[PDB]
């Protein structure tokens, strides 16, 4: 689940103790749920600890948690996680960050 989903099934007031998890302002807490903010690594913890059942960590960043948390995600890969099949296999693609076209380089002798 996401924030914006499980805040939309919270109520106003509701809402306002899921923000008191994270320690944030009731504005700032539905930012990360539209994407128009940033979420710390710190942060991507506390919505998974405020809700553990809906939004986690992995969930708020599907792609960066792989990141921020390897050694976590490198022990579901050993193949322990049998229990369950989840999306992933993220290792087995790999997406280029740099524009060889853009690249250039030219010298004499």
């Known amino acids: 689940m996401t924030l914006k989903?499980?805040?939309?099934?919270?109520?106003?007031?509701?809402?306002k103790?899921?923000?008191?998890?994270?320690?944030?302002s009731p504005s700032y807490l539905s930012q990360m749920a539209s994407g128009r903010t940033a979420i710390s690594?710190?942060?991507a913890?506390?919505?998974?600890?405020?809700?553990e059942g809906q939004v986690s960590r992995a969930?708020?960043?599907?792609?960066?948690?792989?990141?921020?948390?390897?050694?976590?995600?490198?022990?579901?890969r050993l193949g322990?996680?049998?229990?369950?099949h989840a999306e992933g296999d993220c290792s087995a693609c790999?997406?280029?960050?740099?524009?060889?076209?853009?690249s250039h380089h030219h010298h004499h002798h």
């Open 5 to 15: 989903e499980f805040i939309k099934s919270l109520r106003v007031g509701d809402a």
């Open 17 to 24: 103790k899921f923000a008191a998890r994270l320690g944030v």
């Open 41 to 43: 690594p710190t942060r």
């Open 45 to 51: 913890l506390m919505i998974e600890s405020a809700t």
């Open 59 to 76: 969930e708020l960043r599907p792609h960066d948690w792989e990141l921020i948390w390897p050694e976590y995600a490198s022990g579901i």
């Open 80 to 84: 322990q996680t049998h229990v369950v």
């Open 94 to 102: 790999l997406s280029d960050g740099v524009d060889s076209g853009s």
